[PDB]
């Protein structure tokens, strides 16, 4: 009746194993790295990031919020929140060997443009991946942090004698 | 050694009268004397309360007190229940005086002023009475809040948290009677059986039979008591659910041959009606087919040492009533058919 | 590439320390006009072995969940009944893994499930 | 001694009109709102306690109108009565309202009512019936089983969470998330009760399989405040789990480190190190998400101020801690440094990680002269396949103390024929974003200054005005720091240090700067085990006396 299958049920077995590993708390990202060396070791030495980053954007339906509202979510927002955070950490780790076309489709989801109740950690890891590609200078105040934190940190640094270095260039 | 007897019994008398409505003559002097004595006992419990003849002497005194009173007639007074309560005797006294409506005004003021002086004494080496009562209030609040926001009556009673607590208390209370050796445990248990609610008590026995040892002499006593007293075991097996009795019986093989015997007698007083394909009883208190099937199914879904026992007890009772292989003739054939 | 790499050492704490020391002392001698090997050999002041064991190179003998040996006294003992996986595990790791999956079913003290790596029947007796 | 009633008499009506809404908190919204406002209620009660304490009962009618109703509503709400000291203060206030000698019957009714509410707080059986009956039969009072009862409820719930966690995607009873959120609301008032920490630790570790959070951020804020004030003492797995599922709690932790270096413990780097090590941030910053967030905040601060020495020294300390935690607990399967420091060439970091404890004191020069080459290549030859810019190479180079600070002290040792690469590094340290035309002028100024200082050192013990001449711009902090290192190094010092310090310390900012310099220098020396006791005692005395002037 109320049995729910795992949202990585229909995926390629190695991807399934990776997403099973990342589930496991803060040691999820290290375990993701161990998984990738344990597939470099096996018969399929390459790992199909380009297939996983399509599956991460593929949409399926859910009914959340009120009793009745149909909405379409991608995988990245449908799989467990610690799998999410340890994913994006692992994509920071292996960014150079990833296709940009897939990454940008992922980062657009992570940005969560026009959503209530966002994931601050997903948005922040989005920003930190954009900055590392070099397509998210963005000409904004788009920083990983909150406006609250950035303001409370201006408020304290104001109470300190500014240094003779010149790092901002007017 | 002998010096502490007259201290402790006098304090116990004062404590027992604390809860009683004769408080007219009391004064600040009596209350000060009470609480300094209580501090002395709490100091003893800290200093030389472990690993000596003094601890066992005090335990003899306490348990002898609680059995010479017994709990019959003139007063079911608790008293300080055990040697660990020596370390918080002061709190008991203070609470009993705060519950006594009959306390005089000046006594009440002196008391509460001595319990809750304020933050003038925020710095103290020994965990004082004010902190003790505060911590108690926090715990009571915590218990209320967990009970009504997060707690669920678990169906596997042995893993529940209330029953497990009651059980550990019972086991400790049997251990002390065993060490006392004055009256036999069975007499205490028989008196309990008359005194308190039966349905609750039986679940608690069931649960205490499965808690592992912590000092299983406790469970070893209850099995003897149950096998001695048939009437309680008639309602034991009748009231509880199936898996609990199954685990009990698998833990204690001495309960198995009687339990099947209890079930074997409840089947035999059923009768089959042809129009509705169901065994039924004559009297209203005869176990139905569904409950009895549940019990035998639980017994069969068990370790192998009991499966063969129940299976042989069923086959020997089938053949005893004609070795039929067709329904409408033998409850035992019908059971063995329904298990498969 | 020929520039200095991020490099570090695994193995015995008593053997590794002088290597880190020698690296620290000689790291300024790196030169990106030679080869990586021809720089490493005169930096660490040693030569390499060419396949001291080519058959039994190494089989990773770690938990295959936590990737550690020595989790709380326990050893990698529970293995796969398979020629192609042979992957050791721990009791605790493999129990926490199998208790999740939908395929797995628990008898009295037994759990049957799929080996994480190869998805073949594997049995765990607590 | 101005108002004495008005603000408190307003807050009173506020609180009484809030308590009446709350009313025993048997729902979600009442519970959340209580969990928010309870702290301010605590402070309100302290002020009310002072007010009723200084005066007496039954004579005065200031707030005696509804004080009863207030203290009752407070008492029958258990989210209040389980917060830190709220129960103790409500007890105090009821003790203040009592009277020794009642005269009118109303005061006697009051005293009876006070005993009643006190009895409700301490000793009422507002629990399941049969357990009270059973215990009363066995002759156990609530005070001698409630602890074990609490303990057993907590273990039960904690096991249940663990089993709902292990049963991820399995055909079994799923712990309803209403219950998990309920427990998370209950943990908030009684976070500082030791008899509940298992339930906290279990809630943090047992995230489970949901896409949304089931706990609400009041839980996380509560736990974090308690972790940082040292009131709960969890293990490290749980505070990492906390950071890593509530990002504002990790920002709020890193701010609580900045108050320690800005306000409280300016230039007591031993105390900064003690706070950092007791905190879990080094251990937690081995997850790159957390190291990236932490460096982003360090960056914001390097920029708001224009290169504050205090933040610089704090970063150096943090980095040392983080390194000696990464090494410890990154044996198998460790992340590559370009994952923590992604904005630079890995070569440079792999040089700068190498500690100078490991190297002889004489071979520091070669290593610095190599680092200068790599920074110069990375800045000046800014071609594709390199750093993002000069600021990035600087911000890295600053993370690794020892090297950045050792520069001047090696210039003085080689002041005769100064190395141009060290001059470059020093000018880079005290100013990036300058351009080669600026850098050359800076370096030649420094070279002339080194000539004069070497002349003065090889001369006898001379005045302070001869030094103030060369001290007399865009290169002032550099010359100040170089001159301080001259004082500590040369044996001509420990005689005329005061004469220069007094002249340089015009303002308080220069004083703070020199204090920071000297604390950093002693931390550095005591760490590397390099010391001349003359310079140690000299610097300690100057620091002691200047910390009074500020
Ligand atoms: Zn393991
Ligand atoms: Zn396998």
In chain A, % helix, strand, coil (3-state, to 5) comes to 50, 5, 45
Reported as half-sphere exposure (CB side, CA atoms, 13 A), residue D383 has a value of 2
What is the spatial distance between Cα D208 and Cα D188, in angstroms, rounded to a whole number? 20
What count of residues does chain C have?
126
The alpha carbon of C19 is separated from its chain's Cα centroid by a whole number of angstroms, namely 21
Does C17 contact chain D (CB < 8 Å)? Answer: no
Sheet containing C121-125, strands listed edge to edge, beginning at the edge strand earlier in sequence = C105-106, C110-114, C121-125
B-proximal residues of D, 96-135, CB under 8 Å: 98-102, 111-112, 115, 118-119, 121-124, 126-128, 130-131, 133-135
Give residues whose Cβ lies within 5 Å of ion ligand 1: C 63, 66, 71, 90, 93
**Gap between the Cα atoms of D141 and D99, Å rounded:** 30
Helices (H), chain C: 13-26, 36-43, 91-98
Residues 6+ apart with CB under 8 A from B260: B309, B310, B313
Kindly state the tokens that stand for C64: 């295959």
Interface A–D counts its CB contacts (< 8 A) at 171
Closest residue in chain C to residue A25, using alpha carbons only: C66
CA A24 / ligand 1 centre spacing (Å): 12
Are D146 and B200 a contacting pair at CB < 8 A? no
DSSP string, C45-59: T----S-SSSSSS--
Interchain contact, A17 vs C102, CB within 8 Å: no
CB count, 10 Å around CB of B227? 13
Q: Which helix (H) or strand (E) holds D90?
A: helix D86-97
Tokens 């390194």 map to which residue? D323
Tokens read off for A63: 């009914």
Q: Which residue has 């839980």 as its token pair? A: D219
The beta strand positions in D126-264, using DSSP E, are: none
By the 8 A CB rule, do D201 and D235 touch? Answer: yes
Cα D99 from Cα D276, distance rounded (Å): 52
Query: In this structure, are residues B279 and B333 in contact, taking their beta carbons and an 8 Å threshold?
Result: no
Contact present, B133 and B115 (Cβ < 8 Å): yes
Residue with tokens 């089989």: C59
- Are residues D342 and A146, on separate chains, in Cβ contact within 8 Å? no
Chain A segment 25-84 residues within 8 A of C by beta carbon are: 27, 30-31, 34, 38, 41-42
Q: Cα–Cα–Cα angle for D482, D485, D491, nearest 5°?
A: 130
Distance D45 CA to ligand 1 centre (A): 52
Q: Which residue of C3, C20, C28 is the best one to mutate when testing the D interface, meaning the one whose CB has the most D CBs within 10 A?
A: C28
Taking contacts as CB-CB distances below 8 angstroms, the residues of chain D near B147 are: 127-128, 153
Distance CA D285, CA D339 (A): 12
Q: What is the DSSP string of D424-465?
A: HHHHHHH-SS--HHHHHHHHHHHHHHHHHHHHHHHS-S--SH
Ligand nearest to the Cα of C94, by number: 1
The H or E element that residue A72 is part of is: strand A70-74
* Cα–Cα distance, D326 to D345 (Å, whole number): 20
Question: Do the Cβ atoms of C101 and D170 come within 8 Å?
Answer: yes
Q: Which residues contact D59 (CB under 8 A, 6 or more apart)?
A: none
d(CA A90, CA D22): 46
Q: Which residues of D touch B78 (CB under 8 A)?
A: 136, 139-141
Q: Which of D22, D30, D19 is nearest to D182 (CA)?
A: D30
Q: Determine the distance separating the centroid of ligand 2 and the alpha carbon of C62, expressed in angstroms.
A: 13
Q: Which helix (H) or strand (E) element contains residue B311?
A: helix B304-320
Q: Is C14 annotated as a binding residue?
A: no
Instruction: Provide the 3-class DSSP secondary structure of residue B81.
Output: coil
Q: Which chains reach chain D with 3 or more Cβ–Cβ distances below 8 angstroms?
A: A, B, C
Place of tokens 């997850």: D287
C-alpha–C-alpha distance, residues A165 and D428, integer Å: 10
Chains touching chain C at 3 or more Cβ pairs under 8 angstroms? A, D
D16 touches chain B (CB under 8 A): no
C7 is in an annotated binding site: no
d(CA A156, CA A159): 5
Residues D272, D281: Cα–Cα separation, whole Å: 13
Quote the CA–CA distance of B66 and B79 in Å, as a whole number.
8
Q: Which residues contact B179 (CB under 8 A, 6 or more apart)?
A: B59, B63
Resolution (A): 3.1
Tell me whether B87 touches chain D (CB under 8 Å).
no
C-alpha distance from B162 to closest chain D C-alpha (Å): 7
Residues in chain B followed by a break, C to N above 2.5 angstroms: 215
CA separation for the pair D503, D512 (Å, rounded) = 14
List the determination method.
Answer: cryo-EM
In sequence order, which ranges of B70-161 are alpha helices (DSSP H)?
89-99, 105-115, 129-147
Residue B239 at interface with chain D, using a CB cutoff of 8 Å? no
Nearest CA in chain D to B172: D138
Cβ-based contacts of B99 with chain D (< 8 Å): 119, 123
How far apart (Å, rounded) are the C-alpha atoms in residues B80 and B93? 10
| Cβ–Cβ below 8 Å for C3 and D370 | no
Distance CA C88, CA C77 (A): 6
Q: Residue A35: left if φ>0, alpha if ψ -120 to 50, beta else—which one?
A: alpha
Centre of ligand 1 to C-alpha C72, Å, is: 9
> In the structure encoding, which two tokens stand for residue B308, read together?
């063969």
Q: How far is the CA of C65 from the centre of ligand 1 (A)?
A: 6
Instruction: Provide the Cα torsion B136, B138, B143, B146; round to 10°.
Output: -170
Interatomic CA distance for residues B239 and B202, integer angstroms:
8
């Amino acid at each position: 009746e109320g049995v729910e299958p795992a949202p990585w049920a229909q995926l390629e077995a190695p991807a399934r194993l990776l997403l099973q590993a990342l589930q496991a708390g803060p040691e999820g990202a290290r375990r993701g790295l161990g998984v990738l060396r344990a597939l470099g070791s096996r018969g399929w030495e390459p790992f199909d990031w380009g297939r996983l980053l399509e599956a991460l954007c593929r949409e399926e339906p859910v009914v959340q919020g009120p009793d009745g509202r149909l909405e379409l979510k991608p995988l990245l927002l449908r799989l467990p929140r610690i799998c999410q955070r340890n994913l994006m950490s692992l994509l920071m780790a292996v960014r150079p060997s990833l296709p940009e076309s897939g990454l940008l489709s992922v980062l657009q989801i992570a940005q969560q443009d026009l959503a209530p109740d966002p994931d601050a950690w997903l948005r922040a890891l989005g920003e930190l991946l954009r900055r590392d590609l070099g397509v998210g200078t963005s000409m904004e105040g788009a920083s990983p942090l909150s406006e609250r934190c950035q303001r409370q940190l201006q408020s304290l640094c104001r109470g300190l004698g500014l240094g003779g270095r010149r790092l901002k260039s007017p | 050694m002998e010096s502490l007897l007259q201290h402790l019994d006098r304090f116990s008398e004062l404590l027992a009268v604390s809860s009683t409505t004769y408080v007219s003559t009391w004064d600040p002097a009596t209350v000060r004397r009470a609480l300094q004595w209580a501090r002395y006992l709490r100091h003893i419990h800290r200093r030389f309360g472990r690993h000596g003849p003094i601890r066992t002497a005090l335990e003899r005194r306490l348990h002898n007190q609680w059995r010479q009173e017994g709990g019959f007639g003139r007063g079911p007074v608790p008293g300080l229940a055990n040697f660990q309560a020596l370390g918080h005797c002061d709190v008991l006294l203070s609470l009993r005086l705060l519950e006594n409506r009959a306390l005089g005004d000046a006594a009440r003021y002196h008391l509460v002023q001595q319990l809750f002086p304020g933050p003038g004494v925020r710095d103290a080496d020994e965990e004082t009475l004010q902190e003790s009562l505060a911590r108690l209030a926090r715990r009571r609040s915590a218990v209320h809040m967990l009970r009504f926001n997060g707690y669920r009556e678990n169906p596997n009673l042995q893993e529940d948290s209330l029953m497990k607590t009651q059980a550990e208390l019972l086991l400790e209370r049997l251990q002390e009677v065993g060490k006392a050796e004055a009256e036999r445990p069975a007499r205490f248990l028989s008196s309990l059986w008359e005194r308190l609610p039966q349905n609750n008590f039986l679940k608690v026995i069931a649960v205490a039979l499965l808690q592992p040892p912590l000092s299983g002499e406790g469970s070893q006593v209850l099995v003897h008591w149950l096998l001695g007293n048939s009437e309680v075991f008639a309602a034991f097996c009748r009231a509880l659910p199936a898996g609990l009795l199954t685990l009990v019986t698998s833990r204690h093989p001495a309960l198995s041959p009687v339990y099947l015997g209890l079930l074997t007698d409840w089947g035999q007083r059923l009768h089959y009606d042809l129009q509705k394909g169901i065994w039924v009883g004559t009297e209203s208190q005869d176990v139905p087919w569904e409950e009895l099937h549940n019990r035998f199914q639980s017994l069969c879904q068990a370790p192998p040492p009991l499966k063969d026992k129940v299976l042989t007890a069923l086959e020997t009772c089938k053949a005893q009533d004609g070795d039929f292989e067709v329904p409408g003739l033998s409850i035992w054939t019908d059971l063995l058919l329904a298990l498969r | 590439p020929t520039m200095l790499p991020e490099c570090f050492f695994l193995g015995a704490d008593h053997v590794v320390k002088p290597l880190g020391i020698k690296l620290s002392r000689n790291i300024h001698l790196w030169d990106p006009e030679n080869s990586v090997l021809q720089n490493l050999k005169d930096v660490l002041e040693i030569d390499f072995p060419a396949r001291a064991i080519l058959e039994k190179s190494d089989f990773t003998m770690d938990c295959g969940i936590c990737y550690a040996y020595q989790l709380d006294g326990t050893i990698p003992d529970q293995v796969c009944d398979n020629s192609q996986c042979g992957q050791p595990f721990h009791q605790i790791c493999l129990y926490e893994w199998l208790r999740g999956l939908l395929t797995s079913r628990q008898s009295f003290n037994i759990i049957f499930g799929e080996c994480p790596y190869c998805s073949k029947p594997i049995t765990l007796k607590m | 001694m101005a108002q004495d009633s008005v603000d408190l008499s307003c807050d009173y009506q506020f609180w009484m009109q809030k308590l009446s809404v709350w009313d025993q908190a048997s729902t979600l919204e009442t519970q959340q709102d209580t969990c928010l406002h309870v702290a301010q209620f605590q402070e309100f009660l302290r002020k009310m306690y002072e007010a009723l304490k200084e005066m007496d009962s039954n004579t005065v009618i200031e707030r005696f109108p509804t004080i009863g109703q207030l203290l009752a509503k407070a008492c029958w709400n258990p989210f209040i009565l389980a917060y830190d000291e709220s129960q103790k203060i409500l007890i105090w206030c009821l003790c203040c309202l009592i009277n020794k000698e009642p005269q009118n019957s109303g005061q006697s009714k009051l005293n009876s009512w006070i005993q009643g509410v006190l009895s409700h707080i301490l000793s009422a059986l507002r629990f399941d019936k049969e357990v009270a009956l059973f215990t009363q039969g066995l002759g156990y009072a609530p005070i001698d089983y409630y602890p074990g009862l609490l303990k057993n409820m907590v273990l039960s719930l904690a096991s249940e969470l663990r089993e709902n966690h292990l049963n991820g995607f399995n055909t079994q009873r799923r712990m309803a998330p209403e219950r998990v959120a309920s427990l998370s609301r209950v943990c908030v008032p009684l976070i500082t009760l030791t008899d509940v920490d298992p339930l906290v630790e279990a809630l943090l570790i047992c995230h489970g399989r949901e896409p949304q959070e089931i706990l609400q951020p009041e839980f996380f804020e509560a736990v974090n405040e308690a972790i940082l004030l040292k009131k709960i003492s969890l293990p490290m797995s749980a505070v990492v789990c906390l950071w890593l599922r509530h990002l504002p709690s990790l920002e709020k932790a890193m701010l609580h480190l900045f108050e320690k270096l800005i306000s409280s413990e300016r230039n007591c780097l031993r105390r900064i190190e003690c706070f950092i090590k007791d905190s879990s941030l080094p251990q937690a910053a081995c997850h790159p998400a957390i190291f990236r967030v932490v460096d982003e905040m360090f960056r914001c601060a390097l920029l708001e101020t224009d290169g504050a020495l205090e933040i610089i020294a704090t970063i150096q300390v943090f980095t040392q801690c983080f390194v000696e935690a990464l090494e410890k607990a990154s044996k198998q399967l460790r992340f590559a440094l370009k994952t923590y420091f992604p904005y630079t060439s890995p070569s440079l970091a792999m040089v700068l990680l190498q500690d100078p404890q490991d190297i002889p004191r004489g071979h520091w020069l070669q290593t610095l002269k190599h680092i200068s080459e790599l920074l110069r290549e990375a800045v000046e030859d800014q071609t594709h396949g390199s750093c993002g810019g000069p600021f990035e190479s600087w911000f890295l180079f600053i993370h690794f103390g020892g090297w950045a600070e050792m520069v001047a002290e090696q210039l003085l040792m080689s002041a005769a024929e100064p190395p141009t690469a060290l001059l470059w590094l020093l000018a880079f340290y005290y100013g990036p974003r300058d351009g080669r035309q600026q850098r050359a002028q800076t370096m030649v100024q420094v070279k002339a200054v080194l000539g004069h200082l070497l002349a003065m050192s090889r001369s006898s013990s001379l005045s302070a005005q001869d030094l103030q001449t060369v001290a007399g711009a865009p290169a002032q902090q550099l010359i100040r720091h170089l001159l301080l290192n001259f004082l500590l190094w040369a044996p001509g010092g420990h005689t005329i240090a005061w004469d220069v310090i007094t002249l340089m310390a015009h303002t308080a900012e220069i004083t703070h700067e020199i204090i920071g310099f000297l604390d950093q220098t002693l931390y550095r020396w005591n760490r590397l085990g390099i010391e001349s006791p003359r310079s140690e005692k000299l610097a300690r005395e100057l620091l002691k006396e200047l910390r009074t002037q500020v």
